[PDB]
Amino acid sequence: SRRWFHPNITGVEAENLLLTRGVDGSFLARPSKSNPGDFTLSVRRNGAVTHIKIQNTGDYYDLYGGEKFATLAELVQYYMEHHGQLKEKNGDVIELKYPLNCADPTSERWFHGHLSGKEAEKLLTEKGKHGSFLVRESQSHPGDFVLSVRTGDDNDGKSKVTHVMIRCQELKYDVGGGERFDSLTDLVEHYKKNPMVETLGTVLQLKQPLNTTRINAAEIESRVRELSKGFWEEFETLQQQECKLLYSRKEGQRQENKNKNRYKNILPFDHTRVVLHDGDPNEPVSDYINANIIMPEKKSYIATQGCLQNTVNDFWRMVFQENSRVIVMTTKEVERGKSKCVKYWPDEYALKEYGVMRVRNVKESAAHDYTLRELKLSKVGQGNTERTVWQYHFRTWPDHGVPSDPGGVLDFLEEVHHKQESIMDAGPVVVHCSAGIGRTGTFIVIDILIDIIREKGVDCDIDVPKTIQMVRSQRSGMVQTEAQYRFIYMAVQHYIETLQRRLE
């Protein structure tokens, strides 16, 4: 199932759904629209419904009486495979067996709701390609829908748009004959696999949804104005796409690696993890760190967690191996009395060994939002391996939520960018917070977006959710909250405007 999340259901509607359409073991997840970052896992157990709270303030999903997760899709996958592990306050096991699917099409990229045939034709003509499609409400026939699909070659009649009426009869959907579907999703998925064929032979291939999120960067202020009503719905549509990203994380799951993870279920994807070479021959598994390469698709990044006492040496092995010259830390060492990252650097003017690596803290420079530490890193016994590593430690990020103004973050990122650009052949920029997905993902996505604008100027295309999805395919849960999502838009808006004012 990819439809266990119900975006627009109340608690009462969720109970009644589970009691009338589910059985024991049935479950769904849903947001709170009144509360930032609050979610509920509603589960049927012994003919009654229990509601389990999941909180996210920006670092991870924290399931009450369970574990911490990078995404709700990863949470659901974990518990569907690990019975006995989800427990009530009194210790009673809550079983997740039967996802209860949602018919609401608003989480789907192809759903445009209120939209005329003329508007759909103009959007498909201007932005669409062969096989671009969308579903919209009927204006002629209230309660029905229309599927609109561009087919063609790459305006000379070589391409066209076809509209296919979708009747809704007794809460089922059909295209005039054949199967009646329980939701628009089931209908679209069926006709994605078994495309409709016209009388004269055109195959109405449903290849990709119409893109609605790519904007010109100089239009950012008007997109932000529209989304400030709109952000909630755009974020939901992005979040649905996390169900495509359940990539393997087998290395992080090995016994030998379990205690190298800050959180046991927040793990790097095997396909993009940083593999550590040249390890201690006496250490059976020496290749593992909870870190992934993030390559935008000109810098690359390593996204990683805050060090644990037993991973400081591995952190420095990573930095040295990848030739990283800039570290971005976006947590204090301690927040709300809890350790978010061990101090992995020496005191100012001090020299420390961290296994085979030696680090000197040459000088610290305090700015209003950050401290810069000029570090010198070398392998013990090999003096000519010394290189400067500049650690940019952002210190004023709030304990929960996001900054109210993106100015401090943008000034910090500009400085980080310029430092990186000044070092010939520097490796990826290391970015870390606590779990290395929320703040870390936010800083990385802002940096990627501003980088496009920095090179191409104010008149270039950007697509915030497409960029986030691309980063999320390389490390689980990059960008955690709707507040961080809005902050990314705000930061990009503020960056654009500061370029425009320089020209005045």
Ligand X SMILES: Nc1ccnc2c1N=C(C(=O)Nc1cccnc1)C2
Which chain residues interact with ligand X by CB under 6 A?
A: 5, 31, 72-73, 107, 232, 235-236, 239-240, 242-243, 482
- Decide if 430 contacts 304 (C-beta within 8 A): yes
Contacts with 55 (C-beta within 8 Å, 6 or more apart), sequence order: 37, 38, 39, 61, 62, 64
Q: Which two tokens stand for residue 375?
A: 């570090």
Q: Cβ closer to ligand X: 30 or 249?
A: 30
Q: Cβ closer to ligand X: 56 or 420?
A: 56
Has 341 been labeled as part of a binding site?
no
- Decide if 100 contacts 28 (C-beta within 8 A): yes
Residues annotated as part of the active site: 433
Q: Cβ closer to ligand X: 445 or 496?
A: 445
Q: Give CA separation, 411 vs 341, 367, 419, 447, 450, in Å.
A: 23, 11, 12, 11, 12
Contacts with 81 (C-beta within 8 Å, 6 or more apart), sequence order: none
Contacts with 434 (C-beta within 8 Å, 6 or more apart), sequence order: 59, 60, 262, 305, 306, 331, 335, 340, 341
Distance CA 227, CA 363 (A): 44
Has 483 been labeled as part of a binding site?
no
Expressed in percent and rounded to 5, the helix, strand and coil fractions of the chain are 30, 25, 45
Has 434 been labeled as part of a binding site?
yes
Distance CA 135, CA 144 (A): 11
Has 435 been labeled as part of a binding site?
yes
Q: What amino acid occupies position 308?
A: L
Has 128 been labeled as part of a binding site?
no
Has 120 been labeled as part of a binding site?
no
Q: Cβ closer to ligand X: 72 or 294?
A: 72
The 3 state secondary structure assigned to 363-396 is EEEECCCEEEEEEEEEECCEEEEEEEEEEEEECC
CB 99 → ligand X: shortest distance, Å?
11
Has 439 been labeled as part of a binding site?
yes
Q: Cβ closer to ligand X: 57 or 151?
A: 57
Could you list the residues known to form a binding site for substrate, using ranges.
Answer: 399, 433-439, 480
Could you list the residues known to form a binding site, using ranges.
Answer: 399, 433-439, 480
